[PDB]
Amino acid sequence: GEIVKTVANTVESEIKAELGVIPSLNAVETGATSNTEPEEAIQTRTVINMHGTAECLVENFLGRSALVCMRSFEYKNHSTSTSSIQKNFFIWTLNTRELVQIRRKMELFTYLRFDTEITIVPTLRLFSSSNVSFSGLPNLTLQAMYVPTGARKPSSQDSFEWQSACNPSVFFKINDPPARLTIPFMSINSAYANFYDGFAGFEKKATVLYGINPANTMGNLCLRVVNSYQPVQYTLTVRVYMKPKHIKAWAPRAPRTMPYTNILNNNYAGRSAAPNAPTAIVSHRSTIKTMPNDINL
Amino acid sequence: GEIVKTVANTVESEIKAELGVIPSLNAVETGATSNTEPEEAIQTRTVINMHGTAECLVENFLGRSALVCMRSFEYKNHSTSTSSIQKNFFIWTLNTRELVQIRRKMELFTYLRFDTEITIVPTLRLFSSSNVSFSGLPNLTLQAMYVPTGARKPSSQDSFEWQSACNPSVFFKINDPPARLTIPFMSINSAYANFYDGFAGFEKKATVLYGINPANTMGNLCLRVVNSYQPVQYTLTVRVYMKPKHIKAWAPRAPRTMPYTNILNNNYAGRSAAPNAPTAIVSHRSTIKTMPNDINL
Amino acid sequence: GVPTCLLPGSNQFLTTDDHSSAPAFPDFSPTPEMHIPGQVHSMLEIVQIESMMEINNVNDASGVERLRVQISAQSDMDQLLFNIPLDIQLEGPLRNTLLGNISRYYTHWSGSLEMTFMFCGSFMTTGKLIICYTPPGGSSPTDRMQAMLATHVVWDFGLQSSITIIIPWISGSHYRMFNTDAKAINANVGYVTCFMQTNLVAPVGAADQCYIVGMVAAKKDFNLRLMRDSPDIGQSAILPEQA
Amino acid sequence: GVPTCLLPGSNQFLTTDDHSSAPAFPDFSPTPEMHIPGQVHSMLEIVQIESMMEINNVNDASGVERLRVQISAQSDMDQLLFNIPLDIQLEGPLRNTLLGNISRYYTHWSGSLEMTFMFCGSFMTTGKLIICYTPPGGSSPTDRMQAMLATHVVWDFGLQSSITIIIPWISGSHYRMFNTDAKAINANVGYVTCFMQTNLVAPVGAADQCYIVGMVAAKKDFNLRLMRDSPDIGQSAILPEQA
Amino acid sequence: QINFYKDSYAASASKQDFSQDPSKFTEPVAEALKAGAPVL
Amino acid sequence: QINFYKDSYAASASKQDFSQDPSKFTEPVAEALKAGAPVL
Amino acid sequence: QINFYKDSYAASASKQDFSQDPSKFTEPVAEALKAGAPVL
Amino acid sequence: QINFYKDSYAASASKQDFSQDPSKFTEPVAEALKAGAPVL
Ligand SMILES: Cc1cc(CCCOc2c(C)cc(-c3noc(C(F)(F)F)n3)cc2C)on1
Ligand SMILES: Cc1cc(CCCOc2c(C)cc(-c3noc(C(F)(F)F)n3)cc2C)on1
Numbered sequence A, B: 001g002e003i004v005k006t007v008a009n010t011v012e013s014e015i016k017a018e019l020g021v022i023p024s025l026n027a028v029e030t031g032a033t034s035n036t037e038p039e040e041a042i043q044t045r046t047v048i049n050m051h052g053t054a055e056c057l058v059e060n061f062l063g064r065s066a067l068v069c070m071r072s073f074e075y076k077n078h079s080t081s082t083s084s085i086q087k088n089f090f091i092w093t094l095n096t097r098e099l100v101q102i103r104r105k106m107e108l109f110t111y112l113r114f115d116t117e118i119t120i121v122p123t124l125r126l127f128s129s130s131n132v133s134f135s136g137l138p139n140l141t142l143q144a145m146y147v148p149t150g151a152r153k154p155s156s157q158d159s160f161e162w163q164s165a166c167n168p169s170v171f172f173k174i175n176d177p178p179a180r181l182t183i184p185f186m187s188i189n190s191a192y193a194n195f196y197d198g199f200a201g202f203e204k205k206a207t208v209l210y211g212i213n214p215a216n217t218m219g220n221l222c223l224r225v226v227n228s229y230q231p232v233q234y235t236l237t238v239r240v241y242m243k244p245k246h247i248k249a250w251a252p253r254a255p256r257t258m259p260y261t262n263i264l265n266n267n268y269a270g271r272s273a274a275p276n277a278p279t280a281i282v283s284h285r286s287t288i289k290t291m292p293n294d295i296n297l
Numbered sequence C, D: 001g002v003p004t005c006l007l008p009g010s011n012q013f014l015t016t017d018d019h020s021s022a023p024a025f026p027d028f029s030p031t032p033e034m035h036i037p038g039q040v041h042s043m044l045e046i047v048q049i050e051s052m053m054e055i056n057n058v059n060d061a062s063g064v065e066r067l068r069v070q071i072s073a074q075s076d077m078d079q080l081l082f083n084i085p086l087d088i089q090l091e092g093p094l095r096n097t098l099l100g101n102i103s104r105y106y107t108h109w110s111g112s113l114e115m116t117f118m119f120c121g122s123f124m125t126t127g128k129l130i131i132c133y134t135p136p137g138g139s140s141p142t143d144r145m146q147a148m149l150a151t152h153v154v155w156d157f158g159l160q161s162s163i164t165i166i167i168p169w170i171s172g173s174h175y176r177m178f179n180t181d182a183k184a185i186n187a188n189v190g191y192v193t194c195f196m197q198t199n200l201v202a203p204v205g206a207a208d209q210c211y212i213v214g215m216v217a218a219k220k221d222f223n224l225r226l227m228r229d230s231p232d233i234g235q236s237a238i239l240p241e242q243a
Numbered sequence E, F, G, H: 001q002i003n004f005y006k007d008s009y010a011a012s013a014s015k016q017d018f019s020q021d022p023s024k025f026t027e028p029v030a031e032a033l034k035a036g037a038p039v040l
Helices: A058-062 A100-106 B058-062 B100-106 C063-067 C098-103 D063-067 D098-103
Strands: A066-075 A089-091 A109-126 A141-147 A169-173 A179-183 A220-225 A234-252 B066-075 B089-091 B109-126 B141-147 B169-173 B179-183 B220-225 B234-252 C002-004 C069-072 C080-085 C106-110 C113-119 C126-134 C151-156 C162-167 C191-201 C209-218 C223-227 D004-006 D069-072 D080-085 D106-110 D113-119 D126-134 D151-156 D162-167 D191-201 D209-218 D223-227
Touching: A058 A100, A058 A109, A058 A234, A066 A089, A066 A100, A066 A220, A109 A141, A109 A169, A141 A179, A169 A179, A220 A234, B058 B100, B058 B109, B058 B234, B066 B089, B066 B100, B066 B220, B109 B141, B109 B169, B141 B179, B169 B179, B220 B234, C069 C080, C098 C106, C098 C209, C113 C126, C126 C162, C151 C162, D069 D080, D098 D106, D098 D209, D113 D126, D126 D162, D151 D162
Parallel strands: C002 D004
Antiparallel strands: A066 A234, A089 A220, A109 A179, A109 A234, A141 A169, A141 A220, B066 B234, B089 B220, B109 B179, B109 B234, B141 B169, B141 B220, C069 C209, C080 C191, C106 C223, C113 C162, C113 C209, C126 C151, C126 C191, D069 D209, D080 D191, D106 D223, D113 D162, D113 D209, D126 D151, D126 D191
8 A cells, every 4th residue: 555646657668578578468367457567568768747646536536515405395375274284394314315426426335434514505486376576585594404313303384393402403594605514424334335235124024125224214304494484485495415524435336327216226227228228338339340430531 | 037026227328439339230130139228329327217017927917807708598487388498507618719808818828827716797687578577686596517528518407417416516696796716727738728720630621620729628617597487587697707827828929900700710800991900900190201199389 | 803805705605615514413423433345545546447348339239248259260361350449438348447437527537548358268269369559640440551550469368368458648638538529639549459460270179259358447657637427327307215 | 703894895806806716626636837938927028029010001001011111212311211109009100019019908108118120122222311219398300400309320221230229218207108198298208200311322233112120129127007908909799609 | 624613523625645555456366466477 | 825725726826926038039049149249 | 612702601612521420320329339249 | 802903992891900999988088997996
């Protein structure tokens, strides 16, 4: 294990006709990748490469803020003949699989240990009714409440589970900067697992699903409009962004090829034809001797 | 190479009638500019000039914030009978040629290496409809997403390319200060080139255009209204400003004379008559012996 | 109070910003760190791992057929056997590789590549191949006389079952771009071509139609820049629980 | 928390502000610096380079005709040959120069100018000219007796083909302004005039109608201030891709 | 790193660790392969 | 210069470099021209 | 703790006191119980 | 006190002066009264 701030330098190489030395030949059967250097495969010049590697660090590769949740509910009076339930909120059931870019990028490793910075971005639209005159978006107070595993969830906007005496909650308005906080590495294990070759229950029943991990039960995010209902219908759209920090990554995986279909498992249907079809990942060319983008003069 | 914080001082000079010394005569054929000093052309006094030069530094000359993009789209419901495309965004295809003041100023050098500070200034107007009652501009959330070369571009406001898990994106509202960030020196080469005497493709076809540089393929800026459509039509105008920082400049050019016509090449039509006509750059005077602004008493 | 001026960039959310934030679980004790083998510190470690290429990406090969190249005894000499496009950004043999998939998360790249070919015929089957890397400028070679003039390695089958060809970093610019225009000077790497040096010779007891598997990796002089969302994966809607 | 008061100038975008900003590409490695010849550190280096003047900016000269002054053998004596307005801000011979174009990006200027004239007749053609810089106050001289009383140089043609006249910094104020009013005390530099000292004498074998090319540059005592958008370039719309 | 908060996990992106050991994945063999040597 | 961010390219306008070598453009001649001398 | 205000009670959450004496509640007996001993 | 401004009168509430002399108001007598003594 050596320090690599810049890519390897190239050393000047000479003609070499030596018996018993075959640097260009390797045995792939050992499981070892070819160790052949350019210096010993061709005649090379001295090159002092000052290309930096900091952008290919797993901290930089995974430590960008990515969307992990998009939920939209109608902000209005949901009350009817006999309901008494205001329903101006949503519950998510925390996960990192709903959006494929962060999922596929996280799924390039088996295990990840990171503290996560979260950023919530709310947006309002007036609901296009029969008689609706627009004149501006109310500066509503929102409450995002993390309900951990085994805590009572809210059933209404007006519920008293919103007390949040011990539940972590953040209050933030529409016209303010998007809410932000850091959640620590909060697994019962020493790393998060993107794949579980097993079951999360002690029973052998169908109801006990394959792939579900007994460390991904992370609880729920409950977000409400704190303001009581307006005289008109609004649509609140909430976007939650995840930025992994202080990242450790283990056991790199084969990248996902087929499009995801759900968040409970890694099943696939594949696309009808190449690319990313079950029988053809790379698009077809005419023959093994055909260059599809051959430069013609 | 010497340090020049203040302009050159003037030294007192005397009468000089010396054979073999002709400081006022030069040979222009050598390619060298005249080396004749005022001290040796006329009788001068001692002057201690304390005029500073910091304002004529290329850092100061180019390192002002200049407009590089103005795009306006209609913020409304673009949906029809069968579209399902919201179209509340634009794509720019990054460049520095659309606006002539920054173009002509940058085009005074062949090569530039600078890190660039960008500032995005959004503005809304209500669309003047048949029945439109104004009462104020919604504090909309905007997303500017840099889509690098070879990345999937968004086709709609509601597209999932906006994930931006690895694409650099900035979220900023209307009533906030204008969004700002620094893009680094991001050329595949050691400097940006304002002119390319060549082609960017290996083929010799018409489709391969002259002047296009294979280092100006900088990707695209995709900017969206994050908020879903309002009940009324708004017009969002976005202004992007560029401030070069940490600037190195090489091979100063002859300044542009004819008005620019496009961003793909440096072609010209010229103005019908002087000034800046193809056959007359400077305006006409009656004769070579005529002073047009002659002071009369 | 502290004299204050809110600058441009105030109240903005940048997805690539690097700032400390409010801890939601104050004084929370995270699980003690435990040693797990195969810890990755850099993406440049993964692109250095060999991965198979779909050299046989043709509309007659299905599944595992696409990762092997059928090499046969020829009733001819000097003939071209197979080609490899080096357009990582475009749908080609290198796309679905560790190099391809992870480099495709970036826009700029520089450095030498290694391509290793494993011969999978019989111990009794012999042969000599010539694999050639043609730097860009003109057309892909179809004659061995033209291909031999570029960077190449002559491959003798034997106890060492595999050969490496180093595709050396030969470009005017410090970096190349993963661009949608393959024929662009910024993007084009050139061509890899394989010809028969002698022939494939198999005795009656051994099969005449053998196979070659091609692997590609990056060398230690390899770099990536300007991270981007990979075009490998797409999404039309929020992924549901079931469907 | 840190005690804070948002001052006037909070939430403002000033196009001339000097502040650090959020890096969009975190830990991005820019291309290594490479030596390129002709590196410019100051705009004052470019204004010191000679550039041709349109002395013949008349409605009968087209293109390259405008950058040369037709000097002929005179059937007279002491006669004026040509004039040069020194109004950089106004449409005059100095506008389309390196001095002009780059100084025209500023509002204030100070320092001595050099104007070099190259004679382009025959080796056998002789002559003596007198070029005079008249400081401002009154009318431009039309008689040599009046012009000779100002700063001047007498030019003998020979092996050294060019002469310099230093237009020396002679002003009450430390700076002059690039003002639209030419007759303003803040703007006016005065006059440059060229008269015949003797005559142009060419033998029968040589052409009688020769040419002079005038160049102008700044000296090391030259300064510019108060940057502005140049009036040289205009725009009626966003420049399209094609038209 | 800077961190204005009490907890250490609240801090910004961690100080760049440029340690690389690709041998974990590229040469994970009991007996090391010598460069130029026939690796049988 | 100040810079509140990790990257060096994020810093403000660079510290004034007053180095000038106009000879690159004004006297780019193999044999230097001497002041007052006939330069032929 | 930090505190930007004059009063000490205005300060943030106090510096963690990890002192524990559960014997107050778990063994509040005049004669101490010895581990392993018959406590009668 | 702190004061971010040039003038001294712009400063916050002045540093607590705990000096007390209630004798000014409680025993403002030429000849001091002795404790326990008949004060006639
Ligand atoms: C797998 C896997 C799962 C994780 C952790 C994801 C973090 O989950 C969250 C999210 C996305 C948001 C909040 C949250 N947002 O707001 C609040 C608050 F308001 F309660 F503070 N909490 C809390 C957690 C644990 O990391 N790997
Ligand atoms: C020629 C030439 C081209 C350049 C660089 C111009 C910078 O281009 C931009 C611009 C103008 C804006 C953004 C940008 N604006 O916002 C975002 C973000 F939101 F994605 F962060 N990126 C990114 C780049 C590379 O310098 N010389």
